[PDB]
Amino acid sequence: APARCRVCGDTVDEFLDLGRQPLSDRFLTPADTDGEFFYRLAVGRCHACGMVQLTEEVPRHLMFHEEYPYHSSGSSVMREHFAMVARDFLATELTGPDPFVVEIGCNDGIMLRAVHEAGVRHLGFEPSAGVAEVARSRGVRVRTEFFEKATATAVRESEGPADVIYAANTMCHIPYLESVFQGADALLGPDGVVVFEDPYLGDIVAKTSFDQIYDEHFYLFSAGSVAAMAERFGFELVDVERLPVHGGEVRYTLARRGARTPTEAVGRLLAEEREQGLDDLATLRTFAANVHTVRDELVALLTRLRAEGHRVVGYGATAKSATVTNFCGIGPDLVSFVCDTTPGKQHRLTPGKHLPVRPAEAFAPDYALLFAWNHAEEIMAKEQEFHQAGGRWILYVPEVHIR
Numbered sequence: 001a002p003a004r005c006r007v008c009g010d011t012v013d014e015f016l017d018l019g020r021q022p023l024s025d026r027f028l029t030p031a032d033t034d035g036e037f038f039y040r041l042a043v044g045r046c047h048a049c050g051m052v053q054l055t056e057e058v059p060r061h062l063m064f065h066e067e068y069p070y071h072s073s074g075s076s077v078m079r080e081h082f083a084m085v086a087r088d089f090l091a092t093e094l095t096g097p098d099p100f101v102v103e104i105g106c107n108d109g110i111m112l113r114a115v116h117e118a119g120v121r122h123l124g125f126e127p128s129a130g131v132a133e134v135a136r137s138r139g140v141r142v143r144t145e146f147f148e149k150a151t152a153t154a155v156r157e158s159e160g161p162a163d164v165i166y167a168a169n170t171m172c173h174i175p176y177l178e179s180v181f182q183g184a185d186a187l188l189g190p191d192g193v194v195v196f197e198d199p200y201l202g203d204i205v206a207k208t209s210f211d212q213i214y215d216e217h218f219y220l221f222s223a224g225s226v227a228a229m230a231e232r233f234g235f236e237l238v239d240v241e242r243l244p245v246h247g248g249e250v251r252y253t254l255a256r257r258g259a260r261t262p263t264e265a266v267g268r269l270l271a272e273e274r275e276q277g278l279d280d281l282a283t284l285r286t287f288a289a290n291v292h293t294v295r296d297e298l299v300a301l302l303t304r305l306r307a308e309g310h311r312v313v314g315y316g317a318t319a320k321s322a323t324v325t326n327f328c329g330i331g332p333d334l335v336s337f338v339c340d341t342t343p344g345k346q347h348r349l350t351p352g353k354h355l356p357v358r359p360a361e362a363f364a365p366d367y368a369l370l371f372a373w374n375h376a377e378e379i380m381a382k383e384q385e386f387h388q389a390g391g392r393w394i395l396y397v398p399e400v401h402i403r
């Protein structure tokens with residue numbers, strides 16, 4: 001029997017079943033292995049409001065806790081991006097004599113750092129206690145708390161109204177959006193905005209990039225779903241922008257209903273989504289057929305390659321890759337190990353399928369399976385050596401192909 005929509009409570013129509021999955025970032029020490037968590041990863045569309053979402057939630061505190069392993073400042077290009085975000089806010093929203101910006105999911109303080117440094121009052125919400133502490137050491141004010149209604153309301157009471165509430169790669173992790181927006185209601189000034197950027201459903205379908213579907217991406221936002229969501233909560237979609245990062249995102253700007261005028265980009269994106277059928281169950285079924293084809297093809301290839309004695313190695317032990325390995329039944333018998341630059345992932349086995357993770361230097365095989373497809377260019381150039389040697393790259397986004 002079907003899931004209830006986490007926004008409006010109506011029935012969700014499941015369109016893709018990705019099977020039993022581990023938590024995407026629980027890399028196993030061989031010393032433990034035993035009590036590995038699995039859940040059923042599948043995706044559906046609310047029948048009333050069209051919000052695309054997972055049909056089983058992972059409990060928030062099993063993902064967001066004291067050992068949260070994703071550190072934002074690992075990425076130089078993401079450090080640059082969030083500096084730019086900070087500068088953009090200071091030029092446009094945080095222009096007053098004593099403004100205030102709240103960030104949901106501030107992580108190691110990669111964006112709020114630049115706001116603090118501009119002398120602007122701020123507060124991060126970061127429930128993962130470890131990274132929260134990194135943000136604090138860097139001067140950012142942080143509450144080690146989940147942003148929701150009550151926690152947002154107590155910040156209003158002690159610190160006054162916010163001009164901006166920002167969330168980057170965070171809103172799609174939070175099923176309880178109503179509580180989030182009751183929080184925003186309490187906390188924003190009359191003209192304030194909620195601004196969030198997350199993986200975009202349009203790019204997922206166009207690219208068949210189904211490895212964007214894993215535990216921490218409860219929602220696959222579009223302009224259409226976000227607009228309806230907003231409307232339900234007394235908000236309004238007033239700006240949108242497409243971002244190239246993390247495989248394709250949109251940054252959505254909401255204000256309170258009737259408070260701001262929507263930009264021409266909003267209507268434009270809404271019409272694009274409409275003519276492309278992005279709101280149709282039927283389109284999402286085509287996507288799921290395309291995903292099955294990718295699986296069929298990727299498996300057939302890897303098995304052909306093993307029968308012919310070609311060694312295959314994985315490149316990039318991405319959080320996304322968990323979905324591909326578990327969905328495709330790819331274990332050590334089809335890919336011997338995965339090269340990764342993160343030392344907290346090395347000396348360990350990948351979530352669910354338990355591929356050994358070895359350092360980058362281990363790379364120098366006949367074929368390399370490129371899991372970090374969103375950094376393909378960078379990777380293939382760094383490793384020209386390999387492909388000069390007759391090495392070949394198997395990619396599965398947007399299709400199974402070799403290069």
Ligand SMILES: Nc1ncnc2c1ncn2[C@@H]1O[C@H](CSCC[C@H](N)C(=O)O)[C@@H](O)[C@H]1O
Pocket residue numbers: 064065068070071072104105106107110125126127128131145146147148167168169170173174
């Ligand atoms: N209700 C909530 N309020 C605030 N942060 C939350 C939350 N639920 C999850 N998070 C946090 O959201 C983050 C998702 S990862 C995002 C960090 C990233 N570089 C960025 O773009 O901000 C984690 O650090 C996690 O602890």
Ligand SMILES: Cc1cn([C@H]2C[C@H](O)[C@@H](COP(=O)(O)O)O2)c(=O)[nH]c1=O
Pocket residue numbers: 075246315316317318319339340341342372375378379
């Ligand atoms: C770009 C790159 C990423 N990786 C891995 C590290 C991370 O685990 C992951 C990509 O992180 P991102 O999604 O935050 O950009 O891929 C490598 O091992 N080598 C590389 O050259």
Ligand SMILES: [Zn+2]
Pocket residue numbers: 005006007008009010046047048049050051
């Ligand atoms: Zn709904």
